[PDB]
Every structure is written in C-alpha cells, then in structure tokens.
Amino acid sequence: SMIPEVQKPLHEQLWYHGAIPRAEVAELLVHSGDFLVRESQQEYVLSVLWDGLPRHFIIQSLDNLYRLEGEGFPSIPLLIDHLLSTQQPLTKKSGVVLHRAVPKDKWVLNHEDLVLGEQIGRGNFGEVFSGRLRADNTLVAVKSCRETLPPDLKAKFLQEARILKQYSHPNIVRLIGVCTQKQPIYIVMELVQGGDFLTFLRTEGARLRVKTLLQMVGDAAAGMEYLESKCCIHRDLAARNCLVTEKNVLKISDFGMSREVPVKWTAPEALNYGRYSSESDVWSFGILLWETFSLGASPYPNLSNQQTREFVEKGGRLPCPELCPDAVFRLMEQCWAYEPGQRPSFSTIYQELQSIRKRHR
C-alpha cells in the first residue's frame, strides 16, 4: 500500500546511482543488459553493460520530455520502464537492450542523511568533517573527495570504502556509509573521538606513561595482525593514520593505499624494488613504535627523504628514544631488520609488547 515505483522521483529510484564515476560503473554491472542511471560530470546518463563493456547513453530532455532516440516521456523512470518493457534497442547504431536495473548497495547514503559539523583536517583526497547521522545522532567522520580530482582518483578514493565493507575488527576504523548520490562524494566512518595518534602524542604525550603507550601500540599490533590474516598490506602505517578513541583505544585507518611515498616509514625493499608485504608493514610498525616513544617527534629529523634511503641502505637506523624501554627498542630493531624474512610477525610483536607491559607500573 504505497504508490507505483515508476511514479517515484528519479532520486528515490534504487537504480539511480547519482555521482558514481564512470570507472566505478564497471564494478557494479555484471551481466549483459545490467544498467543503472547516473549523473554525468551535467545531464543524465543510462549506463548499460554490452559485450562486457559499459555503454553510455545521454538521456536528452526537450520541452520537458526525456528520450534516447524515440518516444519521449515525462520522467526518466517512465522512459526506463518503457525501454525495459518494449525491449527496444536504445539507439539503432548501438543495438543495446536493457535487461535488469542494478540497485544501490546497502551502504549508500544520501547527503541529507548526514549533518556536517566542523572541519577536522584534510586527508589525501579532500577535507574531512566531523558530523552526525541525521537519523540517530551517531557521530561520524565525513571524508570528502575534492570534486576537481581526476575521475581516475575518485577510484582510489572509493577503493577504501570497497575494502572496509568486508572488514570488522575492534582495532580497525569502521565504515558507516558511502555518499555517492551527489557531489562531492563522501565516505562516512565512525568518528574516532580522540583524533589521530600523531596529534595525540604531540598534545597528550606528557600524560602517557610507558604502560599506556604499550597498550596503544598493542592495539595497533592486534589491528595489523588482523590485516595480515586477510592478506591485506596496509602500505601506509604511521601514527598519523592511527586514531584514538575516547577510551584510549587505538584503531588503524587509511586504507586508500591498502591491497589484498611516506619514505621515512617505508621498508628498503618496498622503496628499492616495489615489494610491499606484511613484512614491509612490520618495518613501518617499528617506525610507529619510534613515534610512540618520541611523543610524536618526526623520524630522521636530520635527514631529507633521499638521505633516509641512503642512510638505511648503509645500516643507519633511528636511535632509541629517551622514553623508550630497552626491550621495546630491541623489538623495533627486529622490526627494521634489513632482511624482511628476519622481521617478527605481528603476532610475535603483539605478544612481546604485552609481555614488556607487565614490567611497567
């Protein structure tokens, strides 16, 4: 007891995907004749899979009527339902016939489902805002994609959402939703209330006893053990990409680079040969441990990026921070073993941090 679906506004249609990039359309259509409707970079486009490729048709509008090449209709849903029913080729020259509408997935949210609050910085692709779900005031982080990035990079942006949809762990930041209906597109995450771990160490560091710091890097080890168990390589592990909850729990984030430039956190073999692995993540973990005990000082402050590569390639490593227990430094040195196979696992790291922590008041 509602109204016919075809009488609902375009923007309510399940097969209307809004501002999804042309690139992303290829990931959503499976079988011949799958289609969806979307906005273009601005008129409307009917994207339909044909011979394994998306084909894109401009829906024209003249004197309030929508059409491809024939009979015009008062709305896009009416046009869609007519093309679907008559099994008409969309245009003669293409010969393409619609077969099934592909709905938005369970994660898509409308822009109006969010209330933006204060800007909280910038990530690799745009501003990030604190905000709330309008429905229930749940606190969220809204990561925006700068509307003038290359449509090729709206892909690397939406890739973090694709990954996170499949992950669930107490030390990994949780995805809430994806706002791809309007520009600018947003990825919506739980708001981790204490901010990023770098600013935390720099602002709150004086209060963080060794026992506490060990609990927080223990959390980062548990998160990374989880990613290792999913064959997920983070590639950008650093304090700036860890977040701190209001109860001091650490969560790993920033899965844009992740896969199933920050030279100073990156393993030699990853820089030299492009070989990224969970072993190169353990290298980055050693650097994170250094940041942790240096109250967020920057690593290798005497060295350019290039000098860091060269320094490391002749056996240079970071020195032991004043606050860093000797046992933690010995662990860090294992994490930065030149031979990647000689580095400890995340399980081993977690175990040794937990053990060291019982020796601190």
Catalogue the active-site residues.
236
Q: Which residues bind ligand GUI (CB under 6 A)?
A: 120-121, 123, 128, 130, 141, 143, 173, 189, 191-193, 195-196, 199, 240-241, 243, 253-254
In the complex, the smallest distance separating the C-beta of residue 123 from ligand GUI, rounded to whole angstroms, is: 2
**289 neighbors 281 (Cβ within 8 angstroms):** no
> What are 259-266's contacts with CB under 8 Å, separation 24+?
259/232, 259/233, 259/235, 260/163, 260/230, 260/231, 260/232, 260/233, 261/236, 262/236, 262/238, 263/305, 263/306, 263/308, 263/309, 264/298, 264/299, 264/300, 264/305, 264/308, 265/236, 265/237, 265/238, 265/299
In the complex, the smallest distance separating the C-beta of residue 342 from ligand GUI, rounded to whole angstroms, is: 30
Write out the binding residues for ATP.
120-128, 143
Compare residues 87 and 298 and give the one whose CB is closer to ligand GUI: 298
**Distance separating alpha carbons of residues 157 and 21, to the nearest angstrom:** 11
In the complex, the smallest distance separating the C-beta of residue 196 from ligand GUI, rounded to whole angstroms, is: 5
Compare residues 87 and 193 and give the one whose CB is closer to ligand GUI: 193
Compare residues 28 and 220 and give the one whose CB is closer to ligand GUI: 220
In the complex, the smallest distance separating the C-beta of residue 97 from ligand GUI, rounded to whole angstroms, is: 42
Q: What is the dihedral of CA 84, 88, 94, 99, to 10 degrees?
A: 30
Compare residues 185 and 243 and give the one whose CB is closer to ligand GUI: 243
